[PDB]
Amino acid sequence: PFTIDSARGIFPNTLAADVVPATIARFSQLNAEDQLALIWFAYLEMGKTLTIAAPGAASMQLAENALKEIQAMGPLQQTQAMCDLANRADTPLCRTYASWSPNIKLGFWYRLGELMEQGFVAPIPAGYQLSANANAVLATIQGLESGQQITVLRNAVVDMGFTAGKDGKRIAEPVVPPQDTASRTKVSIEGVTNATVLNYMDNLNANDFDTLIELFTSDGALQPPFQRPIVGKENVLRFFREECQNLKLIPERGVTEPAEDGFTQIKVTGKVQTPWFGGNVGMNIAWRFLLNPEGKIFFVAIDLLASPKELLN
Ligand SMILES: CC1=C(/C=C/C(C)=C/C=C/C(C)=C/C=C/C=C(C)/C=C/C=C(C)/C=C/C2=C(C)C(=O)CCC2(C)C)C(C)(C)CCC1=O
Ligand SMILES: [Cl-]
Numbered sequence: 001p002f003t004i005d006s007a008r009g010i011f012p013n014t015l016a017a018d019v020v021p022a023t024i025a026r027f028s029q030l031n032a033e034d035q036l037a038l039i040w041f042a043y044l045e046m047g048k049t050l051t052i053a054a055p056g057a058a059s060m061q062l063a064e065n066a067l068k069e070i071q072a073m074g075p076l077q078q079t080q081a082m083c084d085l086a087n088r089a090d091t092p093l094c095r096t097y098a099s100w101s102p103n104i105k106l107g108f109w110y111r112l113g114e115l116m117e118q119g120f121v122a123p124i125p126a127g128y129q130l131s132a133n134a135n136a137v138l139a140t141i142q143g144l145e146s147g148q149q150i151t152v153l154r155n156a157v158v159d160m161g162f163t164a165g166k167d168g169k170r171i172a173e174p175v176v177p178p179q180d181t182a183s184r185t186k187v188s189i190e191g192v193t194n195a196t197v198l199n200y201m202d203n204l205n206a207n208d209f210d211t212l213i214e215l216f217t218s219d220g221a222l223q224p225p226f227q228r229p230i231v232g233k234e235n236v237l238r239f240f241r242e243e244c245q246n247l248k249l250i251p252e253r254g255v256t257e258p259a260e261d262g263f264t265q266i267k268v269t270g271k272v273q274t275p276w277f278g279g280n281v282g283m284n285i286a287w288r289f290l291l292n293p294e295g296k297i298f299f300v301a302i303d304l305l306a307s308p309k310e311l312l313n
Helices: 019-029 032-046 057-072 075-087 092-099 102-117 132-142 146-159 195-205 209-213 233-243
Strands: 216-223 248-259 263-273 283-291 297-304
Touching (some): 019 032, 032 146, 057 092, 057 102, 075 092, 146 283, 146 297, 195 209
Antiparallel strands (some): 283 297
16 A cells, blocks of 8 residues: 555655745746746846856747747737746747756757847846845845745746646657766765665666666656656656756755555665756755665655755765
8 A cells, every 4th residue: 555645755854945836936937027026136146156058959949939929029029928937828939938948948948048138139128126026036035045036947947838738749858878887986975885776877867768667667667856756767867867967966865764555665866967067066965765675766756855964974
């Protein structure tokens, strides 16, 4: 008697940074022009100390057409297209944007940000003043750990556009070939020698998604931070290929415990780096694995932890 939804409760002591979804919820109530101005301010300040990596060439080619169209617009239509995105309005641009994977959306906005700084796309009005709720939301963001700040930014970007009733076409970056076997690193985890867990981390660090997916049970699931579980090999594999490329998992230590019915539950804590920021932002992460008797992954959750004080010991 162990289901995906019940497995979500293992290691319930684990204190996730639920300020992140809380802040996204407050952010999403705001006026669209405040949403845009708020991210503009946060992004400008964050950039004084955090350098964002340039978008990949393939991603920028996929966003090029939409970026060209916006550039050909007059300033008022440019501002209107950005508000449409933030409002999740139903427009052709908003539907194109909603078909994109997160990295393509992120590179789209990265490039609009550069063009706004250069004055080639309508900027945020000079001297713009946020609303009462918006100033408070921005203050909250600026008080978070950098790992939490960039999660808020990405989740806000992913939220934009019109994805209503959208199980249709998905546009994503091409799949990078797995790291050659001779150059792959091998993680070490204090306390944890489980082969499934170590192979999980090593294969993801090598972008070896075909090998990684075979560690899962047919009906197994993966739960990203603050998102519902992704269920089944088909869906988990799609997620890997479209959204999980070029991560760096740096686990540190863990604990291994029996679970009901010859299962095993393992919790590991450490850091994860996104290619957007590399070593400049280390996110505090827990991994919560539920393995069946054969060692297959029935459930794995990845949690963004509330602070470094939540890392094991
Ligand atoms: C929008 C906008 C702007 C632009 C703003 C811009 C350019 C914003 C860009 C912000 C960027 C690029 C943020 C990068 C975020 C990446 C994160 C949080 C990834 C974490 C990865 C994790 C947790 C991986 C976890 C994983 C592990 C380890 C697994 O083991 C399994 C897989 C899994 C994935 C779960 C302007 C500046 C133009 C202003 C207007 C405006 O609105
Ligand atoms: Cl990423």
